[PDB]
Amino acid sequence: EAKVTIIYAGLLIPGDGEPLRNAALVISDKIIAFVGSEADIPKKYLRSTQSTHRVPVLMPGLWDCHMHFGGDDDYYNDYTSGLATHPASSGARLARGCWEALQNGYTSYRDLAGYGCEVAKAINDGTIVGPNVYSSGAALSQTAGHGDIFALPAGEVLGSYGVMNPRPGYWGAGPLCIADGVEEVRRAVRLQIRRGAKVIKVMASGGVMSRDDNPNFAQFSPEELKVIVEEAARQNRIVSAHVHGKAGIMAAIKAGCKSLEHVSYADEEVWELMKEKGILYVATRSVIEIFLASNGEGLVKESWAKLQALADSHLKAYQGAIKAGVTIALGTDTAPGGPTALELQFAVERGGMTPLEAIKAATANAPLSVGPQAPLTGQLREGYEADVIALEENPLEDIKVFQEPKAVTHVWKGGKLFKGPGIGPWGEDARNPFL
Amino acid sequence: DEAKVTIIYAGLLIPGDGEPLRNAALVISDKIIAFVGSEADIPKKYLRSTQSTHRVPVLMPGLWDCHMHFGGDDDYYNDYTSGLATHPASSGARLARGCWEALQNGYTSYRDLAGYGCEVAKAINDGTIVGPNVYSSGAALSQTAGHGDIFALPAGEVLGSYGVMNPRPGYWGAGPLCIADGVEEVRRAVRLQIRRGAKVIKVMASGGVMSRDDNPNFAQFSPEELKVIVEEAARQNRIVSAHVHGKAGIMAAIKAGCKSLEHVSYADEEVWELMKEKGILYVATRSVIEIFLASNGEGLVKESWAKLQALADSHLKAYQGAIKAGVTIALGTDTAPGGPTALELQFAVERGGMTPLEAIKAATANAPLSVGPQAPLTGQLREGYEADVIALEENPLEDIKVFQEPKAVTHVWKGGKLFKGPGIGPWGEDARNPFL
Amino acid sequence: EAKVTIIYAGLLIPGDGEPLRNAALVISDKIIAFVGSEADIPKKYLRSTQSTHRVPVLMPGLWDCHMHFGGDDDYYNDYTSGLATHPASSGARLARGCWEALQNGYTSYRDLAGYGCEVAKAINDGTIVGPNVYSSGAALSQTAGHGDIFALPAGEVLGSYGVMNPRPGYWGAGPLCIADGVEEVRRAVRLQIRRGAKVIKVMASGGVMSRDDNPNFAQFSPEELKVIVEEAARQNRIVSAHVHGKAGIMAAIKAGCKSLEHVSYADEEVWELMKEKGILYVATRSVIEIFLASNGLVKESWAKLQALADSHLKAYQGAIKAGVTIALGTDTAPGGPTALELQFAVERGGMTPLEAIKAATANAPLSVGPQAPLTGQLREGYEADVIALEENPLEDIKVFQEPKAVTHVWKGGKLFKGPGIGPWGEDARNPFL
Amino acid sequence: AGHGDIFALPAGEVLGSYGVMNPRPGYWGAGPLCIADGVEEVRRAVRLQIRRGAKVIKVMASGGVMSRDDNPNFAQFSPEELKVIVEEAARQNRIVSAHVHGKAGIMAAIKAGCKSLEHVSYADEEVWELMKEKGILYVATRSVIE
């Protein structure tokens, strides 16, 4: 017999479309069986329902499309810590982060550098809890690219992350992958798919800080990028590209990347291209706002001016893409359980989205971030996956409501209740997996 | 700011080593126990200053298990291949659940004897997750063709992963097992575990219980290697724990200076006296034998099943004999974190012949002996000792099986901090999201 | 609150353009705020100036566009020393050389093989002093190219300098890089950028000595050269090519190299190509003059060297007459006899002393393409790399060969040599306290 | 796991750089630190410094002054290794200098034949007489504590 749950909602926000007043939603097992007004609930569900809930606001589970599953020790302040941190330490930390994500109403995460694949195995076998994780495995970078650890010598970095010299020690399974040339890059992509990656991530321009590589300059050759995209496509993955400057943006687009990150120097030409080819825009404004709040605290005056210049372009680019009708999704660029809700605030207060459009970007649009790997999800619609959250207050009146996890009262993932009144930390019917 | 003072009134207080007290009270000041005795004798200064008070039926020290393995393995391979094949990020995530579950059951200290205890301890100590105090061995040390080897894989794959030659990228020297042959290599083997933060050293000193590949009746490592291993551990104030079944292994481990023995299946009168004389801890791990006894030799050949039963009987005699002879004993299960550790207390009583009170002594007061000089003053409800304290609904002295229901453990303190109790969230009192 | 310096000059040589008599220059912080005649100094600077100087001759800081930061031990006489010398020994030596360079009025160096990137970190953090260093990192060579150490076996050389087999021991950070094939050469370029290289250097023909490889034959395939140039261009670097014979010269040009070194067999066809495409000519005549002054070689090998020396002279003179853009380079260690190259520009090339100075100042930043700031000229808005002289070099170009004649040296507006100024520059502190 | 080890990096990276096994290109055996375990390895460790022209040999004979990773109170190296180290230095007319804090380290270094001690933080009456008796130099390095 099927497990039926009825949820009555004062306000129901479907994800893409006008909200409904005095609505109801039916869950049958893993899927959403009915959505519409309370009066029109099909009678068969009224007869069979195992339980009913009554909440002020109901909506789809939230996505963040730019996470990194690092779980780093707090010893080194740069990417050295990705290398130096033992992955067992990382996985333990990510377990807390995944718990915290789900308690905040985030039911799907796109991991773009780290151990998402490996940690997903502990979610999927029931040992821990968390969002659906769609991981890139390692971010792919060139030597001297944004993925390289410039402070370490090169042999140490490529010994750890290169695709030559197979060896013991979990070779080809770190947060970063360095490959140079068409030959190496084929293996780079395949090594992530091997881990179970459901997306591919490349560094296609320099890092936002201008110290080693330059954000204005492209990374990888067009030849390498095209192969990377072809390799991903053959297994039904799309590629996501880290891009700031227009050189990087255009090279990534030409190659066939279907998701761009940051996109700091996107202009009219870029917005039209992205619309034309169905390329997703993930701004990660949180990352810029963090360093803006620092005020150039330890930085040299000219480097701080450079960061502000980039911050202004990034704002124009984001606002322009929103005005131009480019398809947008929300991503924070943080660890699991990080301040992802802020990105919704920035979508409204910086981007100029309505609260309703901001929610569309974190729900209905978000599965586009993994292309053909997405199930029917991110919307409260019949036949879609039952990833549903309930709120105490109406986020359309204050988008900051998501920044208080107590305001998220109920969390369903695949029809299963992971947070709610009377529900323990590890979800309904949780048992000790080691007993 | 103030010292944090907590007063706990207990209908029955079980100190760990000594007669229980009725209508007692315990005072916590910050991380240590400030007072223990009868309710009437609480020093007045604490009555004035206390931040909070609790009232529980039964109070006792936090429980130790002295034989855990922090593996966190994927379920794919059924032998030790999974230790090698499982990515440690998968392992750590699993061990995080297990550590939570341990603490909810009243286990405030664990001795990890093969695995990622050191690496997972960093996530406990920085507040990211919660768990027991973890005293880890890092990797178990084994010889080539020892109980730590993965016989089903070819040798170059195993020693490439776990050997102490050929340094390389990929977290070299930081797995669940370490293979070393010869005095030179075993020095590095010990040092590599200390490097990770190991607070104990574990060696395979005889074959595995199953007897498919190596033989439990035969000793492992040379006496020369064992002595060096013990010297290396001693120089950094660690003791060595030895996996031993047959008497050859037991005697070699004893001669070398090992201070804790595991399983000890063929211990006899001679062994019990030696262990008493030299202050060597006996950790029986009866749970491991009971598991395969409950199977009835289902997947096994008739002669191999008979051999397992013979070993099971010796192990029982050895355990009972050691208890009768007054050898110092501690409890260990040989399971993953959050495993069925409470059963070992049942077996201490129902198999070993301990009183429920002696069984509790073995899981509390005696247990820090399992890590030698690395132990703080803990495992007892005594003034000056660490405030690892648990509260129960029911009296375990009347039914030792009470520990098998985690709901019966109502309050858990670790270093004076409340990790379980009425109104306390899953990650302990005053828990914050560490990622904000 | 800006730091303002006024310098009055009896003669001011801007670098590109007619010199001015009785001029003045204003420095504000790191840049040049004003250049023109003494009478026209904007009054705001007269009010605010922290100090004033009065010198006979003022000009931009000098560039040398062909240096090698080797710092080799004196033990081996060939490239074995690059391999055998411990880099700590090298860096110590280069520190002296960088000091000496700055005392001679050389405020920018282009390093084309060695540890320029690594030594630049000690200049930029204030620990030592020296010119602005624009380094190539390692010179890129093919196996059996001019960068190979033929006297050592091949496994030793490629173990040290190859781009396969990452390992401990500062892999990918030596004075030479050996790469074969399009795949390897991509990494070769990236490995230099990783170190902070602001230019890329390739061996595109054999060495001037004809013993192992031949100067008349090209090196690397056109396929590899094109990729090398593309890889450099993507990070806004240009490629400099070591070239002697015409085969090498033409291959380097075709690929997109923007600077050529030696250029010994350049003819009419080459000069027009270099003009058309904006390719810089760095002759390094000093290198030829050294071996000419020697006359141990076999008779036929000495004739071959003389033949090459004559072609090199014709090529240089022809390029000057044809109006190819030229810059000066010596091919020596830091603190080496770089000033001699100016002498050879005049006495061998046929440049006027003014044109020779243009080649060592105004034209020289072209040697690093888009990595150059506005520098090499005494002009408003340009970087304050300025030197002062006791005597007029337009009357005797050999004046630069006496470092005592260089009385004041400014780099980024900071005084590193001048009356009352200590060895480590103005306001120098012991960095280790 | 001694005071010369870089605990924050994984062990393969450190011993790849500073160990005395696996000779390779890249100025092997010529860094600021040398990691060696066992009598066999320590012989080469000493010889590798002499090779560079070393006019003294330095050992870590106890933990670092900070008590984070290793412990200053505990000795480092075995007496067996220390004795060989001293014999190897002596054969080329070098003495050994020992980094020592705790008395365990101080005594082991003295017993082995070290002729210079550094820091010497837990030196007491017994130590002072020993150092006088055997002609062992005391280098306090008080600046580091200050």
From Swiss-Prot, chain B:
Residues engaged in binding Zn(2+) 1: H67, H69, K202
Keywords on record: Carboxypeptidase, Hydrolase, Metal-binding, Metalloprotease, Protease, Secreted, Zinc
Compartments it resides in: Secreted
Biotechnology note: Detoxification of contaminated food is a challenging health issue and ochratoxinase is a promising enzyme that hydrolyzes ochrtoxin A, a mycotoxin demonstrated to have nephrotoxic, immunotoxic, genotoxic, neurotoxic, and teratogenic properties; and that occurs in a wide range of agricultural products.
UniProt-annotated catalytic positions: K202, D334
Needed co-factor(s): Zn(2+)
The UniProt record lists the keyword Cell membrane: no
UniProt-reported outcome of changing S91 to G/W: Affect substrate binding and carboxypeptidase activity
UniProt superkingdom: Eukaryota
Gene3D superfamilies xref list: Metal-dependent hydrolases
Activity regulation, per record: The Zn(2+)-specific chelator 1,10-phenanthroline inhibits the enzyme activity.
Residue sites binding Zn(2+) 2 per the record: K202, H243, H263
CDD domains recorded: Met_dep_hydrolase_A
Top-tier EC class: hydrolase
GO MF annotation terms: carboxypeptidase activity; hydrolase activity, acting on carbon-nitrogen (but not peptide) bonds; metal ion binding; metallopeptidase activity
Cellular component terms (Gene Ontology): extracellular region
SUPFAM superfamilies for the chain: Composite domain of metallo-dependent hydrolases, Metallo-dependent hydrolases
Reactions catalysed: ochratoxin A + H2O = ochratoxin alpha + L-phenylalanine
Record note on pH: Optimum pH is 6.
Assigned EC number: 3.4.17.-
Domain notes: Each subunit of the homooctameric enzyme folds into a two-domain structure characteristic of a metal dependent amidohydrolase, with a twisted TIM (triosephosphateisomerase)-barrel and a smaller beta-sandwich domain.
Protein's job: Carboxypeptidase that catalyzes the release of a C-terminal amino acid with specific catalytic activity for aromatic amino acids such as phenylalanine. Is able to degrade ochratoxin A, one of the five major mycotoxins most harmful to humans and animals that is produced by Aspergillus and Penicillium species and occurs in a wide range of agricultural products.
Subunit structure: Homooctamer.
Identification of the protein by name: Ochratoxinase
Lineage, top ranks: Eukaryota, Fungi, Dikarya, Ascomycota, Pezizomycotina
